[PDB]
Symmetry: D2
Amino acid sequence: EAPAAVVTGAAKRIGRAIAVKLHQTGYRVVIHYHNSAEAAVSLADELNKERSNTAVVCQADLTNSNVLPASCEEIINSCFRAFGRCDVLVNNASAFYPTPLVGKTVETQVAELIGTNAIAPFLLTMSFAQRQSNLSIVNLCDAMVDQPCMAFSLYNMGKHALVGLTQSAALELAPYGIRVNGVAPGVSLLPVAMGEEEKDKWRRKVPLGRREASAEQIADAVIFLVSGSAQYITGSIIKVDGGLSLVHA
Amino acid sequence: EAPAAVVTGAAKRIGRAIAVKLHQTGYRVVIHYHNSAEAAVSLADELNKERSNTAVVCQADLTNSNVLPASCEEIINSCFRAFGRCDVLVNNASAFYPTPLVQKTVETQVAELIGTNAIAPFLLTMSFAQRQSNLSIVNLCDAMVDQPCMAFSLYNMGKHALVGLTQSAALELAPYGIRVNGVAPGVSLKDKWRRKVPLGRREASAEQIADAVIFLVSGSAQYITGSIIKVDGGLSLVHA
Amino acid sequence: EAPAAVVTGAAKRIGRAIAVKLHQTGYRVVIHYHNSAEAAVSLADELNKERSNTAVVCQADLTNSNVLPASCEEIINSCFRAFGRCDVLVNNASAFYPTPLVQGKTVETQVAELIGTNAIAPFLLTMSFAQRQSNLSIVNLCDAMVDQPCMAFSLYNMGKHALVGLTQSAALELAPYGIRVNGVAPGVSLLPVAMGEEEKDKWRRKVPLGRREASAEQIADAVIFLVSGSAQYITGSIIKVDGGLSLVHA
Amino acid sequence: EAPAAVVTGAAKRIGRAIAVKLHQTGYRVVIHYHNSAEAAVSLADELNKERSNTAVVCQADLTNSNVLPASCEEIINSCFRAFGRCDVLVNNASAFYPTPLVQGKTVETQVAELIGTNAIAPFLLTMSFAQRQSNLSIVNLCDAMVDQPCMAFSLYNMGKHALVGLTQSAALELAPYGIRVNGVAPGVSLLPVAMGEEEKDKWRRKVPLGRREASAEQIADAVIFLVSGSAQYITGSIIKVDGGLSLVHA
Ligand SMILES: NC(=O)c1ccc[n+]([C@@H]2O[C@H](COP(=O)([O-])OP(=O)(O)OC[C@H]3O[C@@H](n4cnc5c(N)ncnc54)[C@H](OP(=O)(O)O)[C@@H]3O)[C@@H](O)[C@H]2O)c1
Ligand SMILES: NC(=O)c1ccc[n+]([C@@H]2O[C@H](COP(=O)([O-])OP(=O)(O)OC[C@H]3O[C@@H](n4cnc5c(N)ncnc54)[C@H](OP(=O)(O)O)[C@@H]3O)[C@@H](O)[C@H]2O)c1
Ligand SMILES: NC(=O)c1ccc[n+]([C@@H]2O[C@H](COP(=O)([O-])OP(=O)(O)OC[C@H]3O[C@@H](n4cnc5c(N)ncnc54)[C@H](OP(=O)(O)O)[C@@H]3O)[C@@H](O)[C@H]2O)c1
Ligand SMILES: Nc1nnc(-c2ccc3nn[nH]c3c2)s1
Ligand SMILES: Nc1nnc(-c2ccc3nn[nH]c3c2)s1
Ligand SMILES: Nc1nnc(-c2ccc3nn[nH]c3c2)s1
């Protein structure tokens, strides 16, 4: 009776806030993770303490390879095994690091940045759709996709590809009652590795409050798109960026 | 106590559905009208029956003229007079009709399709901002702005200007805590069109439009500014 | 036999560069101006010395009013009166100044100038150009920064957005008549005359490609391309000529 | 000293027209091909007949694999070995076929081909071109219909969106080296040879400007503009050459 959702990269940060908020809304959740096993299991525990049998973890590397399609099939399969249905897919997992044009090989960087950000979402969408009410998919896009960070070409290419996926899947899956939309953060939870001075630099550019989005503010937008209040919305990407993308150089 | 909202063109169709849903969310509402007095009063009567003195009407012609600034000032003033505050402005009033390039005087068409659709929103935004917690403005945009209807140049120009207003005002009013966003309908703005809509199994409704407005004004959108949410069932994604 | 073009606001700066380059390409030109009469006649003189009877001036206020349609009709009529044809229209004239939302022109004067020159006059000129009708085209001078606007420039930004709308709508509607409609969108080109060098340099340093503004000739080069036979399948396109400026985040 | 250009997928159709036009403009050219050896060689021979020693061919599969980076480096290197320089890179090669989301080549083969040719190979060639480095520029062949995609072409559409991102990212990053990066976005150009005329006509009828597809030469014309001295302030721009097709509602 309770709908179920898959959230990729849900152990920490934005994915975690999305998983929590979906769960609070009445969803049973698959918490996908890659490396963060301790945090993933700890979240599922917390959620199950609240309503028993409403959260499972599922481990998978979302780097592109010849076995990525089986890994994505497995993620969707894990939701059906635990819950007997899969109503919502949130493509939240992402690799993010510079790849300048001028210790990983370039084909590894391609496999990670294009695999996680675009190919895995595509295969997960395929598996989600094939395995099939208010069905929908939400992709975590990037509000700054047309004003990209310097030396982030592969990342930016993957995020552009994800816009294409959002539009193409919205068109193709509409006759099956599956809506596909995006949420596009500007600056939200900044990278762990980033110094406080660089963090503050980005914070000062944001027109609305000179602060980053909380993870919860991003999840709020995801909640809207999966809700019955968004039933005529497909192929839309909602910026949740405090106006950052509007600010000229 | 309760927040207050101005909705332009609120007597019928989309503006009515927006006024109703804001009222249901707990807003006091100014129902603006130009020609539809009976409809505006009927809505106000319906809302006041639910909760006393929570709905007023306000007449103004939104055509561009030397008196448009005064009229827009009055609309915002009427909210402050009735309710002591003005938290939300919904720029919903719209004129819609073709203006072929190869052939009402043209300058009258300009006054309506640019005046009502873009200049009135600009003047209302100025007045709203001047007279100033979760403050926001929502502009009713058009999902088909980049694939426009044939021979609707002035209309299309006004809706493009309204996008520009949404972004410019989002930037300039952010320091004041005023968020500025848009909702862009499709076919809600006949059977031939519905069959082209990807989510065509669902009928388009004014309430679906209002649902997106309600989100953008809510605390669930407090970091969202300068965004335009398409509510078009995927229509804008469909090639010719 | 030579084709003819109207350039609005052509007395100086980018409009002059466009009129000159069209003239060098073999066009006869209507140099429209509003206040810059000396500069306009002087440019017509230069072009007419190069080839006689190839340039005329035409004075018009492009502020919106109930007579703006007549003024726009007259500009197009001037081209047919001088040259017997009108092949190209370049909507280059523009008012540009701030209009803050929170507070000695009246607001309705600001609307009439910023929306009139930037959008309504281009619409009326387009109407008159089309109705008076080979390689026919219209080029609108747009703004590469239309989605990352200057703070407190709402009316200017609304006008330039409206011009993108006109470009697309007119391309759609006029295509059956063989009239192409395209746009050229500068980022920073010739900085305002009233701007001091220090402020100019702040803008210059933002530009990835060479940390300098576009020359007027660089803008004109893109106009020349769009009116040329090398752009015969291009309509409804807006070419940024911005040195990468619009790609730079805050 | 004549400048040099690499054109990928240059044996036929659009890439061929681009190679021809660049050669006519005075470029020496590397004609890259995958399967079309006879056509590539016939083009090189025709070009060398016009001016000896101005065209070479270079075979490479541009499908993504662990050897793709080496292949792309070899394509750029072949330009330097043949001509001593490489001024222009045109990323034209493309795979195009449907990949339905709901139910041959395996899906990972489809990924390697559609994403490899359309996006990753352009990225690797851009890296190699830049690492090797006056009017240097790259032109990527994009798709004017990228936001109104064909039904069931998700991977193709993803690859073309990725290419827009590459165009913008590389424009920003390479601007300090004086390398401009732009795109040309056809709508309907040369249709498949086997596609029935009745099917070709369904697409032709949708084009506002002339109810016809672009010739390969019309696409090449925009490429020539972008690499020319007339575009030296243009970077990060994508020119639609689509006859207004992308402006047409459903
Ligand atoms: N934060 C921002 O400011 C911002 C801005 C724009 C867009 N976004 C987008 O919003 C989403 C969430 O942002 P975020 O900052 O929360 O993301 P994040 O913490 O950088 O990454 C989210 C998760 O992705 C997973 N991941 C990384 N590489 C992976 C791989 N090869 N296979 C499988 N999973 C992998 C990680 O899982 P494990 O920890 O389990 O290994 C990680 O916890 C992302 O899609 C991001 O691109 C965020
Ligand atoms: N320069 C830049 O950096 C830049 C950046 C983005 C976009 N653009 C666009 O490119 C185009 C040319 O730029 P620019 O700097 O050369 O323009 P500009 O010098 O600011 O203005 C060009 C001409 O517009 C005419 N004009 C102004 N108000 C008018 C009115 N009410 N009626 C009739 N004509 C009027 C003036 O003619 P008179 O002198 O005869 O009175 C003026 O010479 C404009 O459309 C502009 O918006 C320029
Ligand atoms: N034609 C149109 O209407 C249209 C519309 C939108 C966009 N475009 C874009 O414009 C560009 C040119 O269009 P087109 O129709 O002329 O292209 P096309 O003929 O479909 O393909 C161009 C060449 O790409 C090469 N190619 C394909 N797969 C390859 C692989 N795995 N490795 C290496 N090379 C490969 C082929 O080379 P070989 O023959 O040597 O094997 C082919 O001749 C393309 O990027 C296309 O996407 C075209
Ligand atoms: N401007 C930005 N600074 N950090 C960003 C960021 C941080 C974490 C991310 N995870 N995925 N993508 C991310 C972008 S975007
Ligand atoms: N960023 C910019 N700095 N100056 C700009 C400018 C200069 C002259 C203009 N005339 N019309 N519009 C203009 C914008 S845009
Ligand atoms: N609408 C379109 N019809 N055919 C198209 C087409 C034809 C050949 C291509 N090669 N790459 N991409 C292509 C698109 S696009």
